[PDB]
Ligand binder design. Structure first.
Ligand SMILES: O=C(O)c1cc(/N=N/c2ccc(S(=O)(=O)Nc3ccccn3)cc2)ccc1O
Ligand SMILES: O=C(O)c1cc(/N=N/c2ccc(S(=O)(=O)Nc3ccccn3)cc2)ccc1O
Ligand SMILES: N[C@@H](CCC(=O)N[C@@H](CS)C(=O)NCC(=O)O)C(=O)O
Ligand SMILES: N[C@@H](CCC(=O)N[C@@H](CS)C(=O)NCC(=O)O)C(=O)O
Lengths: 210, 208
């Protein structure tokens, strides 16, 4: 049996990046699907530390919070930079990704209809920093930080892929980010995973908007 | 060589300053006035257009939690092993989630939402009381038996909530004892009583 178990709703949401990480790294994991019915029952919610999913288990280590899970996997699987300097930069990129993810989630669940236009207008300004980080690292030819993949790469890749669905062509103005997405999307295991029913047949968000 | 660039408020820099002080580290403060910020040049050079900005030698960092993790990693305040490091991260993310709600209240709707906020508070503080009860009965730190960067961040969050809602920790025996115990550490105690800390407002709009 797999030592990894991810407990989540049947959506990609905040679990898309860690699933891409596990798949690309050749790890096995078990998915425990939580239906809205089961969640509204109350018992599972009450046992979750902050009353929220995802919940992750590595052996008998139970974790909550998507970024804690990413950092844990980054640390145990060696996807956290080659030294402390790179680890700090990997963290800085991930926090940036998380900041934009929060705005995206707010749009999707709070005011999709009304704020989608303003959101898409401000997007270039939000994506520029990542284009800049990439240009400073070997000319954007490898990963977001250093010359080895890190957990921040999977998180950034997911953020870019869901924005391409929200605003098709938003990456056209960013040559380095565009090439980065195509390059990472082509990795053997990741490519196989992104094309699988497991990934494709899951909606991005829980309210049907994207 | 540490340098923290920030506005003249405690805000998101309070915890890292408490960390540096308690650990006996020296740092230089570069104050950014609203005037200087509105000039535009500094903002434009900041990676995500925001402060704090931190320098460790020639390593320039942005994002308060990135700075905390960096100091946690280099100063040895990140748990004794990977299992503890993951738990330290889980506590910090929880602190950051409540901090975001606090900041939203303070700057978005202080007058209208303060009552609802204070009513929901016990529910938000319970998880930390529970974490503490599971660690040697709440007698040491939030994770393990050594202090971590999450302790300083949680301490700051609890101290600013006591200012917002005096007595909110009365219902939480472990959190109450935890605050008093950490607040009594020699260097931290000296720092929390200094002009450098005391004479700085908590937030930029005067609300607290
Ligand atoms: O950050 C987040 O991930 C975030 C997520 C939020 N909600 N997620 C949800 C909400 C409802 C469900 S659900 O299981 O009831 N319904 C579903 C499940 C699968 C596909 C479509 N709908 C699944 C996920 C709501 C606010 C947020 O900030
Ligand atoms: O997360 C945050 O830190 C956060 C911070 C925010 N604003 N911070 C500010 C805003 C204005 C200033 S300021 O330099 O113009 N004014 C000041 C400075 C010192 C004391 C009182 N006011 C200083 C900090 C606004 C929204 C946020 O979400
Ligand atoms: N900060 C947490 C947030 C997790 C979160 O928002 N979970 C949502 C779904 S993705 C949830 O559990 N919603 C149910 C609820 O809060 O009632 C993380 O990064 O994992
Ligand atoms: N996620 C960042 C947020 C930083 C932030 O919100 N900075 C605010 C003040 S603390 C800022 O620079 N505001 C000026 C602006 O954005 O115009 C962090 O944790 O440091």
């Amino acid at each position: 049996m797999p030592p990894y178990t991810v407990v989540y709703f049947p959506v990609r949401g905040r679990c898309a990046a860690l699933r891409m990480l596990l798949a690309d790294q050749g790890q096995s994991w078990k998915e425990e699907v939580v239906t809205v019915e089961t969640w509204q029952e109350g018992s599972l919610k009450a046992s979750c530390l902050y009353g929220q999913l995802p919940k992750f288990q590595d052996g008998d280590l139970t974790l909550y919070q998507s970024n804690t899970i990413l950092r844990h996997l980054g640390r145990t699987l060696g996807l956290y930079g080659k030294d402390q300097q790179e680890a700090a930069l990997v963290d800085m990129v991930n926090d940036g990704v998380e900041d934009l993810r929060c705005k995206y989630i707010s749009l999707i669940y709070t005011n999709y209809e009304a704020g989608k236009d303003d959101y898409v207008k401000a997007l270039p300004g939000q994506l520029k920093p990542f284009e800049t980080l990439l240009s400073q690292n070997q000319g954007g030819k490898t990963f977001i930080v250093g010359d080895q993949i890190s957990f921040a790469d999977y998180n950034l890749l997911d953020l870019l892929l869901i924005h391409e669905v929200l605003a098709p062509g938003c990456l056209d103005a960013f040559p380095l980010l565009s090439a980065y997405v195509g390059r990472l999307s082509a990795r053997p295991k990741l490519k196989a995973f992104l094309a699988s029913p497991e990934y494709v047949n899951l909606p991005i968000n829980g309210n049907g908007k994207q």
